[PDB]
Structure formats: structure tokens, C-alpha cells
């Protein structure tokens, strides 16, 4: 059989596609596991796979798109058409904006850390899988129904995950300010070193502005993302004495068979490790 050729920009979107499609498609993911998906140089295999793809999925909302951004260049060089060849899986989410003045009101891309947005992403993916490969529409709708139900159950769990923490140590601290959608959905405020990965990552003023906040609000743990350099947060851990309780998953899933190796698993890991860390 001549399977649908799908390209996804990063491992999160690729995994959601895999949850809908199973083994029915030919799926390529551009940004490798553990790498930053905001700025990446596609390889010749990536450019080739993108040209031959039947459908391309990207995050949108200022993750890999925009002026001179890597995905924008990629699809423009391949002569692809928006909403015919390539689709933003975030279409339909309620966008939250970056707050730093230098970011001039641009969108914050990290919608998927709200499980309800993960459901929106998955529905957008299934829509285009069915529209371009109707022969497998039955599988796509059965997987979509089962997957959405699992994400909905995890979303219910997330909404009660932090009820035992006192509203004085409810602070999720990560390197990148990637938790705005999680904070909004689940009632746990967040702080960061740098707001978005495209800024400079770990300057003295960023680290000091965070250390001052860790003096007012003092949580029992810090966390480090799997896709960032750990050194800035280790410095934050030095000057504050607060331990890095675990790594968490924001911009990438983990490798197959390790903890957090899917969208579902990375969110269950995040919910468990963050709540256990903040209670210590």
C-alpha cells in the first residue's frame, strides 16, 4: 500500500500524529529528540522529506514560524501552500502572549502544556489525516476518540494535582518561560530565567532577577527541561540553595522507552514530578 507521507516539525507533534495514525502512515519528524524546536537548521533529509510530503504539520503561534524563522523558510523554498500542504496544529487555541517588552506582544507558542490544547492539536491532525487519506478514516477516528478520552482524564487529574500544596510554595521554576498555558489551566504560577528560547539564555541579569523572586516566593524545588542547557539553572540552584528535583519535558519528548517518551507520558511525568517536587 502507498501510505500517506507526513512530516511534523517536532517530536511532540509527531507523537500526537502517531497516536492518531498508528502504523498507517509514513511519518518524519524534523527536530531531533532533545533539541530546541524554536531554531533549527533542517538537514538535506529534512528538506527532501518536506518536498515529498503529502501533509506537513507545524506548531504555529511563534514556535518555528514568522519572518526569517526556520520553518517559514523551509516551506517557502519547497513552494508549499498554507492550509493545502501545511497546517498549524494550534489553530483554534486561545493564544497567550509573551510578556517581555522586547518580545513586542508576540505569541507564546507553548500551548500544548495545557492538555485541552493537546486535544485541539490532535483534532486538527486527525482532520487533515482523514481529509488526505480517507481509506484509513476508520482507524483515525477510533484512535482520535480513544486518545482524546485519555487526554481528558489526564486533564481532570491535572486540575486537582496541586491542591495539597500551600499557595506559598506553588511556583514552577524552569529555564524557559514555557509554562504560561500550564499555569493558566492548572493554577500553578511559573517563573523562568529567559522567557523564550530565542532570547539569550542565562545572562547575569536574568539569573539575578530570578534569584530575587526565589527570595520572596521560595519553593522546595527547581526543574530543568530536557531540551535546554542545564548550567544556567544549576547556577540558580547554587545561589538559591533550592535543589533541581528532576528534569521535565517541555519542548521535546524523550527517546522511546525512557520516561516521558510520548506527549501523554511526558505530561503524566510532568504532573507527578512537579507535584512531588513542590511538596518536599
Amino acid at each position: 500500500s502507498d501510505k500517506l507521507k507526513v512530516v511534523a516539525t517536532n517530536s511532540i507533534i509527531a507523537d500526537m500524529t502517531k497516536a492518531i495514525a498508528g502504523d498507517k502512515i509514513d511519518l518524519h519528524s524534523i527536530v531531533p529528540i532533545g533539541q530546541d524546536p524554536h531554531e533549527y537548521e533542517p538537514l538535506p533529509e529534512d528538506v527532501e522529506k518536506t518536498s515529498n510530503a503529502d501533509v506537513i504539520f507545524y506548531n504555529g503561534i511563534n514556535l518555528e514560524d514568522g519572518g526569517q524563522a526556520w520553518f517559514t523558510k523551509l516551506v517557502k523554498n519547497a513552494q508549499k501552500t498554507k492550509n493545502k500542504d501545511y497546517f498549524a496544529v494550534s489553530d483554534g487555541i486561545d493564544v497567550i502572549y509573551l510578556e517581555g517588552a522586547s518580545e513586542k506582544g508576540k505569541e507564546d507558542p507553548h500551548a500544548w502544556l495545557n492538555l485541552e490544547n493537546g486535544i485541539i492539536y490532535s483534532k486538527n491532525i486527525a482532520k487533515q489525516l482523514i481529509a488526505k487519506d480517507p481509506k484509513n478514516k476508520e482507524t483515525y477516528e477510533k484512535n482520535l476518540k480513544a486518545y482524546v478520552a485519555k487526554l481528558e482524564k489526564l486533564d481532570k487529574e491535572a486540575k486537582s494535582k496541586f491542591d495539597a500544596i500551600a499557595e506559598n510554595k506553588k511556583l514552577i521554576v524552569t529555564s524557559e518561560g514555557c509554562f504560561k498555558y500550564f499555569s493558566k489551566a492548572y493554577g500553578v504560577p511559573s517563573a523562568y530565567i529567559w522567557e523564550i528560547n530565542t532570547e539569550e539564555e542565562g545572562t547575569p541579569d536574568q539569573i539575578s532577577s530570578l534569584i530575587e523572586k526565589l527570595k520572596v516566593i521560595k519553593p522546595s524545588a527547581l526543574f530543568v527541561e530536557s531540551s535546554v542547557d542545564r548550567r544556567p539553572m544549576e547556577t540558580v540552584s547554587k545561589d538559591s540553595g533550592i535543589p533541581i528535583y528532576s528534569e521535565i519535558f517541555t519542548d521535546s519528548i524523550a527517546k522511546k522507552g525512557k520516561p516521558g517518551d510520548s506527549y501523554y507520558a511526558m505530561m503524566k511525568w510532568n504532573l507527578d514530578k512537579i507535584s512531588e517536587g513542590l511538596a518536599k
Binding site: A19, D23, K150, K255, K256, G257, K258, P259, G260, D261, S262, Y264, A265, K268, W269, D272
Partner: protein, 126 residues
């Protein structure tokens, strides 16, 4: 703490079926993927079926797709492998392994931390 014990193997006629069980006698088993693996003499370890913590099933070895099915009984803390149309090439030690906070099972070049002793499956006519 995670303990896995297999059962159900032995000598089986070519063409027949066999159901293996993986009994999990640790706990918090709902947060683990469970994979069935096999090792035949002179070959690499093959992951033949996997069920993730979200209940998604995956089949990483093409030569058993459609013949092998994995399932989970959460109340029993047991994972079953149903093997059909068994071939001489399926003779192996079959073992299960557990992967915390995983939906998928590792490829052959990854190390494997929680696994059972394994059960011999020999496909031949005696």
C-alpha cells in the same frame, strides 16, 4: 521493587498458538509500559509487543505483526502475549520488561532495567 514473572511457555507445535503471561508483583503498575521481548540464539533482542502506560499498543518487530497481540488486565496486574501461527524462527526465550512513565518500549541498542527471568518457547514437533 518492580518484579515481573512470566508463565505459559514450553514446547509448541508449528502453526499453533500460545498465550504468555507477565505477572507484575511490584506496584503502581498503571504508570509503566510493559514490553514483551525475545532472544533467539545468535540474533539480536527483538521487542515483539508493547503496551504503554496510556494503553497504546505498538509492535516493533515486523515479522510478528498480525500474529502477536499484547493486552493488559489492570485488576490482575498481568500483561498477556497471544502468539499465533508460530514458526520455528519464533523459538526463543521470551521475557517481559517494565518501563516507568513510558508509552513505548526501547529498541535493541538500549539497556533494559526491570525484566523477568524469561520463559522458553520452542516451536517444534517432538
Amino acid at each position: 521493587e518492580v518484579q515481573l514473572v512470566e508463565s505459559g511457555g514450553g514446547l509448541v507445535q508449528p502453526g499453533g498458538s500460545l498465550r504468555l503471561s507477565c505477572a507484575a508483583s511490584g506496584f503502581t503498575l498503571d504508570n509503566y509500559a510493559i514490553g514483551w521481548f525475545r532472544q533467539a540464539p545468535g540474533k539480536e533482542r527483538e521487542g515483539v509487543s508493547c503496551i504503554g502506560l496510556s494503553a497504546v499498543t505498538t509492535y516493533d518487530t515486523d515479522s510478528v505483526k498480525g500474529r502477536f497481540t499484547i493486552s493488559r488486565d489492570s485488576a490482575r496486574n498481568t500483561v498477556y502475549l497471544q502468539m499465533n501461527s508460530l514458526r520455528p524462527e519464533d523459538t526463543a526465550v521470551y521475557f517481559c520488561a517494565a518501563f516507568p512513565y513510558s508509552d513505548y518500549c526501547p529498541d535493541s541498542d538500549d539497556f533494559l532495567q526491570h525484566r523477568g527471568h524469561g520463559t522458553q518457547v520452542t516451536v517444534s514437533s517432538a
